[PDB]
Structure 1
Amino acid sequence: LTEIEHLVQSVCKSYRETCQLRLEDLLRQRSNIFSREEVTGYQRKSMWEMWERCAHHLTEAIQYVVEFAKRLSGFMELCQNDQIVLLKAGAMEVVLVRMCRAYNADNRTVFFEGKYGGMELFRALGCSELISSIFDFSHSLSALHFSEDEIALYTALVLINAHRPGLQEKRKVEQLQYNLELAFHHHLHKTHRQSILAKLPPKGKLRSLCSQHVERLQIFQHLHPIVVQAAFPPLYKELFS
């Protein structure tokens, strides 16, 4: 078996071990939808409470993406600067992509605290525009019906991007990126799924949505700080300073 077929297997394994929620569970729970009364309960919570809940869920989701990154071939052999540069730019882009698995395009609901709810669940945050953009992005991804293996390979490429500003060893990230691009393209060809390539988000789209998202989280963090046990302190200290 080729280096490339082994790379496909390694990335798909890493994803399976760090996917946080099982696709099977997410699909089964689609019928489990918040009642009008439960939605009203969430809308009546203080911004501060909804922020504490959402901030903690987002931090947990980031930590699954850090673990995913640490299991990708070559990631740990990059200099720490480059690990931080990739995860700082990339980890929340991966969370936003991972969301499409927990999103039902039929009723525009997301899996949140054990049931599916629409974007009005989050009314107390005062972020309707930004949250609507996040729901829209998941909506556009859901049309692809990504396989588990496609999302493993795609989210590896979201992270391993030699064009991120600030890399010391751009050559080394280029080498890992070329191999992951070949693995993704190789797997799509083998599974007759090259049709998704033209349907993938235009680039800049994920970067600019993620930029806006993180900007808002940094404002909330500045006004009402949460603390977590840092999975990757050098990275954590670059956002939670």
Structure 2
Amino acid sequence: HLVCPMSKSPYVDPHKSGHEIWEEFSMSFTPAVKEVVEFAKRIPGFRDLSQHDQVNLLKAGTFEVLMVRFASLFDAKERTVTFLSGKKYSVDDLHSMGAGDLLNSMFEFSEKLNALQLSDEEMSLFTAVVLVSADRSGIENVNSVEALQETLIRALRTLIMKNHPNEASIFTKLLLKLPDLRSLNNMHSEELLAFKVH
């Protein structure tokens, strides 16, 4: 199976070669990836980073951006995951096909985030913060990346304070999701690389 909801379905044709499986999978996830590139380009300070650093932040952060953007695919009440085809699958069925601890963690994250009930403008600005908070391992101009992050974070504080004047803790709660996203990224990358088709 292929229990990633970026796929159209978790069922894999055992006659198809691995190259063929991956290529099919790629027609499903590539449009989502390109959408993160387009989004990055609309963060004004992102264009002022070095070309190398833009590419590196996208490299390290795309997953974390997509995890925020697709948190709603995880329905903690119904205990279902919606794949990009529109089809829904139960957690039990997905556990049976090889999902495990990482799926559970994703439900946990998604439930807490989905819960905060962010507006679109709030979610959008948070997502920008997530992107520019990506792992700095490849980065050549660290101070420029931290400056953009600080800029976006102040903007986020100002927006949450306008929209939630008596609940400033929402701001802090969002920042606390950054290490959680990094943990999800870490574990997911292990699953990605350990993926075999036969």
1:106 CA drift (Å):
1.9
Q: 1:214 aligns with which of 189, 192, 196?
A: 189
The equivalent of 1:233 in structure 2 is none
| Structure 2 SS opposite 1:164 | coil
CA deviation digits over 1:56-108, x for unaligned, max 9? Answer: 43333222112111221121232222112211221101111112233333213
Taking structure 2 as the reference length, the TM-score comes to 0.75
In structure 1, distance between residues paired with 2:23 and 2:103:
16
Larger CA deviation: 117-126 vs 127-136: 117-126
1:116 CA drift (Å):
3.6
The equivalent of 1:190 in structure 2 is 162
Q: Which amino acid letter does the alignment assign opposite residue 190 of structure 2?
A: E
Q: Is 2:138 aligned against 1:152? A: no
Larger CA deviation: 51-60 vs 79-88: 51-60
CA, structure 1 residues 97+75, in 2 after alignment: closer, same or farther (shift >3 Å)? same
Q: Is 2:36 aligned against 1:62? A: no
CA, structure 1 residues 54+44, in 2 after alignment: closer, same or farther (shift >3 Å)? closer
Q: 1:135 aligns with which of 80, 91, 107?
A: 107
1:173 CA drift (Å):
1.5
In structure 1, distance between residues paired with 2:99 and 2:23:
15
In structure 1, distance between residues paired with 2:117 and 2:31:
24
The answer as to whether partners of 2:60 and 2:134 remain within 8 angstroms in 1 is no
In structure 1, distance between residues paired with 2:21 and 2:78:
22
Q: What percentage of aligned pairs have identical amino acids?
A: 40
The answer as to whether partners of 1:105 and 1:142 remain within 8 angstroms in 2 is no
Q: 2:81 aligns with which of 100, 106, 110?
A: 110
In structure 2, distance between residues paired with 1:162 and 1:96:
13
The answer as to whether partners of 1:43 and 1:123 remain within 8 angstroms in 2 is no
Unaligned 5+ runs, structure 1: 1-41, 225-241
Q: Is 2:179 aligned against 1:204? A: yes
Q: Is 2:65 aligned against 1:94? A: yes
RMSD of equivalent CA atoms: 2.9
1:178 CA drift (Å):
1.9
In structure 1, distance between residues paired with 2:24 and 2:107:
18
CA, structure 1 residues 43+88, in 2 after alignment: closer, same or farther (shift >3 Å)? closer
Unaligned 5+ runs, structure 2: 1-8
